[PDB]
């Protein structure tokens, strides 16, 4: 217990599946937690039902909005203190090969999974950076971070950005002592709200051919890799990608 | 010789430096080539320098110009016929780390080296697809679709994206039978105009830390891995990297 | 607390160095540890180190000794129960590139390195299956499974091997629903005894162009990962590689 | 033409399949090649098949046989002159599980496909290296150096080495100037004399699910990119794998 005392972590898209997962395990390993979503009436809900104020809140925010990441640092150091620690998890899907993708889906798909990331590392460093909190910045990729998927060039190609984008801040970050870590994280698939209410979604997902454990994970399975790259047990982890994904990428 | 018999080419940024090598090598091989960049004095010297216009010619576009990809397929088709080949070569690179970089030199550098490799790949594949073409469409990346550089945040961003992409794009196109390959091309350092212009560059880069050959490549380097991926001998290429980058990766 | 509680592990090489923080850890989250080495009078003093005879023991095995697996399989039965856990650390290391590398060196290093592995993983598979264990076994690799070092052919040969095996087994693991999971953990540069019996070693190995972190890791850091992969926590992680190397391979 | 101009090749396993359009290939492109395989009958036919004695010669060798290689260099020196180009390409495979595979199969796979390509690789850097001959050296790996096969255990362990030892190999003799390259070959399923003699190898190896491309390569598919690798337009590559695979890994 305790793996996480004394930090302060901002997760985006925190008040749905993987993102309140993480939130409550960060929450009961001591941690302070600020999750985002864009609508309050989920987000608040969120909070209240994993802890109290002093240790968890909902912050509004669209994560493709610029200006509002440096609302949602401010708010997060007003009722914690010093942000060290970022999971930029928000992301979005479109259910488009390359070849049918609009260009209007393929700019709002990158505005909120390459732009929002972008902005959140950046703006994470600049405010973690020099402090000895053991800053670390968790960016949410993907298998589709690794493989191709016919059906989703755009969210292929931002996770393949934040992939390579992340080791050049981790290396950054080493390089200059900054005392922040910079790492992915790969769910496979994963039990969330959104595959539920897509039928024989699940089933798909299942087949050995594409998880070759027969089943998809649960969001628990993400928070926990989470834990562990938040945590200073990881304090020489950084430019790495963590995978969990029931075996999917190993075939 | 004859490798590109009767193959038609698109070569984005072909008239400088790598994309002039590749144009040049595709012509040599027996391919039509159409080449662009922004700037018509170095294009259209570039064409003619290389060929005559029944072989080779120029149109300036800018690879961020979604409206002039259009163009640029009718004006290559007129001239030349069917397309079959896209080298999507033009980029740009911002000396920036993630932490520094300024939202307009994010977005400008996604707009060539990211919006447009996806607007040339979009429209190759339903320009190329089901005519028999031996159709292949030839992304190019770079070392730093693969590792991060601390102070190449933006393109290391884009070449990771572009990396990932274009497995999307192989994949759909494999399984609909398209006759259309996507590889990508992942040059280490060469010796461009771009590198000599830059004092102490080349010897930087010539460090066997960075590459452990001790000195950095040509344009005729990533010419000759462009030839086999546009000729029909790749006819089962697919979905992958090629790298020439004298063991900067391997290390 | 408690992360390994009911869990019975093996780790091999765990009487020094990486190999006894990981059972240390072990320990310390409940489980009980069978640790091996060559030489008795390091092992029995490291197990009595860490805990009592009820916590840890030692059991004396060449990791390429084939029939000694078993009886080190048995062992540990008779003192904890059926094993739910192998860690396959036991490794040693050559000084030589490929071109230098005697065939007596190569089969040597490859007996411990390769063979170890296989038998330790083979057998593992036939005892920890469908028992309900959650099993898990934890191949050690390198960053020397990912990239090559000009001085190290034999060991880079034998831990690019173990990487890809593990996935075979990974994945015949899930698909038969065998309760067994199997990954990779490759370390970069790590304080151990024999890096500190080395003068000028960590100085290398910390020049920011081998680890951007400018200093190696302690073997704690491997403990922590290794205690996440033994847990249930990585039920759903099989068939991944988890690196912890200060951003080495990142660059 | 005469891509291969001057060049003087070994190809182990060249006398069936792959290795025989290799050498066909490389015939037809200028080289002089040496073919081997443990079977006379086959090994005099192939060659005679391809080219007259001044062309292309047989040399009876089971590439696990050390002393052998010596007296392979040897014969080919004699034969053609130095030597400049090697194709590490003969190898078997086990039907077989880690779980199922015996200690004697283990070891007769790891005879031919690790230590052969070792006893190769190191011999080819001792005779070619300081010659001004452009050498380079081609390991054939395979997707399966990539991603695990559940009933490939012995033959992925073998492969996923090759593939590493070989990025060793690579930066020792281009750290010292050895004007020797190194690179990996990974096929994906190819139509060989093996395949079309297991009832339903093809079929099952065409499913999408497997190769996206929904069919197998040919054996000159193998050929083209060995051509690239062996010849002075490829003389900027070293450390690096080269896929061949109709999609298969980029799922
Ligand atoms: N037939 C259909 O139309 C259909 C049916 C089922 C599912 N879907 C899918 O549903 C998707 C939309 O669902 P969803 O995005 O609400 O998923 P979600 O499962 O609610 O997203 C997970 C978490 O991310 C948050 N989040 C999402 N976008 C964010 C952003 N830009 N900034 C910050 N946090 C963000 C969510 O909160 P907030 O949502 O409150 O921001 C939530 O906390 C569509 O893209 C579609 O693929 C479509
Ligand atoms: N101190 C300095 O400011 C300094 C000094 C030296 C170098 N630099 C670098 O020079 C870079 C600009 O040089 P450059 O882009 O002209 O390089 P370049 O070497 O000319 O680019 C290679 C090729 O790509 C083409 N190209 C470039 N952008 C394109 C686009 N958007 N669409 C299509 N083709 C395109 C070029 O033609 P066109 O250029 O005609 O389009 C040319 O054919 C700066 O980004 C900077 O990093 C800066
Ligand atoms: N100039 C020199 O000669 C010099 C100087 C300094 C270091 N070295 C290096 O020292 C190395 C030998 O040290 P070491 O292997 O004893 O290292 P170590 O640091 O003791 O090895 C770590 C752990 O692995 C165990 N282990 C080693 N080989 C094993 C095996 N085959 N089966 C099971 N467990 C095994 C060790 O216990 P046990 O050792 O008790 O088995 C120990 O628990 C040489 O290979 C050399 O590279 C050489
Ligand atoms: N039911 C069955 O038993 C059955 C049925 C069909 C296929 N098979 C498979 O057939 C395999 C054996 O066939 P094969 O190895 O002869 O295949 P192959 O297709 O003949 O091998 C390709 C090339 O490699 C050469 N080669 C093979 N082993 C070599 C070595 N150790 N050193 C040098 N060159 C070598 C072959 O020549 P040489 O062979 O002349 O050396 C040939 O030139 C078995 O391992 C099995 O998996 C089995
Ligand atoms: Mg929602
Ligand atoms: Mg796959
Ligand atoms: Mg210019
Ligand atoms: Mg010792
Ligand atoms: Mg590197
Ligand atoms: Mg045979």
Request: hydrophobic fraction near 40%.
């Amino acid at each position: 217990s305790n793996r996480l005392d004394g930090k302060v972590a901002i997760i985006t898209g925190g008040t749905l599946g993987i993102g309140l997962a993480i939130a409550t395990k960060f929450v009961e390993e001591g941690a302070k937690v600020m999750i985002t979503g864009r609508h309050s009436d989920v987000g608040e809900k969120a909070a209240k039902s994993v802890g109290t104020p002093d240790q968890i809140q909902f912050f509004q925010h669209d994560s493709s909005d610029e200006d509002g990441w440096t609302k949602l640092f401010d708010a997060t150091e007003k009722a914690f203190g010093p942000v060290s620690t970022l999971v930029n998890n928000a992301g979005i899907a479109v259910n488009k090969s390359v070849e049918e993708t609009t260009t209007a889906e393929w700019r709002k798909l990158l505005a909120v999974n390459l732009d929002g990331v972008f902005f959140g590392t950046r703006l994470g460093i600049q405010r973690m950076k020099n402090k000895g909190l053991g800053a670390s910045i968790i960016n949410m990729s993907s298998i589709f971070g690794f493989v191709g998927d016919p059906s989703l060039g755009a969210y292929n190609a931002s996770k393949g950005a934040v992939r390579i984008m992340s080791k050049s801040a981790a290396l950054d970050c080493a390089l200059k002592d900054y005392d922040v870590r910079v790492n992915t994280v790969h769910p496979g698939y994963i039990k969330t709200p959104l595959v539920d209410d897509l039928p024989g979604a699940e089933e798909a997902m299942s087949q050995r051919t594409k998880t070759p454990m027969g089943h998809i994970g649960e969001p628990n399975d993400i928070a926990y890799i989470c834990v562990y790259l938040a945590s200073n047990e990881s304090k020489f982890a950084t430019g790495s990608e963590f995978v969990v994904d029931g075996g999917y990428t190993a075939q």
